[PDB]
Design a protein around this ligand. Structure first.
Ligand SMILES: Cc1nc2c(c(=O)[nH]1)CSCC2
Length: 357
């Protein structure tokens, strides 16, 4: 007969977060923003098979792009097949040909977001145990438990609160300053074991990772990942910034009522011996031999003399506290702001999640 729904155990802020990151409207908004046809590709219709087939179309396009003219299919023809697999919407005009490396990576980045949307759908599937029991958790407790990631809301007087607020305020944009609403301490267990492997590795820094809302659930469940087909200015790794304003550019938020809500992570990254670069290298898949990280160095860096430390699981972790200052050694760099790169998932541990407006 009628199953009982148990009261929610979660505080209001965490309830709102959980509502936001599993929101169907949000997921569909993200798809429409990536030019996808949500009518032809419903959320409940998304499959891993479809996404794999899309990546296979992009791989064929990549091969056609990298040359030469070998008498294969045209770029228009191979685009047309991609759009059969992954329906796009451009006001019912024909979609554009995927005919440049820039556009190709954009379609790769899109499919990676769609893969993390699919993940959140699959995660929500009702299990057979859940159908037999006569009392069920509040839907938000259920969704929270699916993450298998401990979240703890921080209050104003938490040991790290002011340190994190200062990091945000001092390294964020001077005019378009993102407003802190909430901070959660993040404990994704199953990250801990692989992270402990790097315990001898010094040079740890708390670094920003801005993200769109559509991939937050996947990150909470899985950690920050190096996905096949991922890339960027410093190659195939996980990207962090010491400047909030740099990471805030990657925060795709959503309109709530009269405000715009978005999410940013702080990860503890074991950088070890750093290799500094000053020119883009999209082909990097690891640091040079003897290095543990690659730092694309910017014209500016948060004033190192203002750096502080937090103790996280018995380790000292550098947290920038200073406004960006010019670095004369990197004044001719192709990077205005630094991008911090690691090339294995175990060198980072999620530590904090911030809600910003
Ligand atoms: C998704 C994401 N990308 C990057 C950053 C980020 O915070 N998020 C900062 S470095 C440049 C790339």
């Amino acid at each position: 007969s009628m199953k009982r729904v148990q009261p929610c155990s979660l505080d209001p802020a965490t309830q709102k977060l959980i509502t936001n990151i599993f929101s169907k409207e949000m997921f569909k908004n993200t798809m429409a923003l990536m030019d996808l046809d949500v009518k032809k590709m419903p959320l409940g219709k998304l499959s891993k098979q479809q996404i794999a087939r899309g990546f296979e179309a992009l791989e064929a396009l990549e091969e056609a792009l990298k040359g030469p003219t070998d008498g294969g299919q045209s770029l228009e023809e191979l685009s047309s097949h991609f759009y059969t697999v992954i329906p796009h919407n451009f006001g019912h005009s024909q979609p554009p040909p995927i005919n440049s490396p820039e556009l190709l990576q954009a379609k790769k980045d899109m499919l990676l977001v769609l893969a993390d949307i699919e993940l959140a759908q699959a995660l929500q599937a009702v299990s057979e145990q859940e159908k037999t029991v006569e009392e069920v958790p509040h839907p938000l407790d259920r969704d929270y438990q699916l993450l298998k990631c401990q979240l703890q809301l921080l209050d104003s007087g938490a040991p790290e609160y002011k340190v994190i607020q200062t990091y945000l305020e001092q390294t964020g944009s001077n005019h378009r300053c993102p407003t802190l609403q909430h901070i959660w301490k993040v404990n994704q267990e199953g990250e801990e074991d692989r992270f402990q492997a790097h315990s001898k590795l010094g040079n740890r820094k708390l670094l920003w990772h801005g993200t769109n809302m559509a991939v937050v659930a996947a990150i909470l469940t899985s950690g920050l990942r190096i996905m096949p087909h991922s890339g960027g200015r410093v190659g195939k790794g996980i990207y962090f910034a010491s400047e909030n304003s740099k990471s805030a550019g990657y925060v795709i938020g959503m309109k709530c009522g009269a405000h715009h809500v978005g999410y940013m992570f702080l990860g503890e990254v074991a950088l070890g011996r750093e290799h500094h670069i000053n020119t883009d290298n999209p082909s990097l898949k690891s640091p040079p031999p003897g290095f543990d990280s690659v730092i694309a160095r910017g014209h500016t860096e948060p004033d190192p003399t203002q750096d502080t430390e937090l103790e996280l699981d018995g380790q000292q972790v550098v947290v920038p506290q200073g406004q960006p200052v010019p670095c004369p050694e990197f004044s001719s760099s192709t990077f205005s702001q630094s991008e911090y790169l690691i090339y294995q998932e175990s060198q980072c541990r999620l530590r904090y999640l911030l809600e910003v407006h």
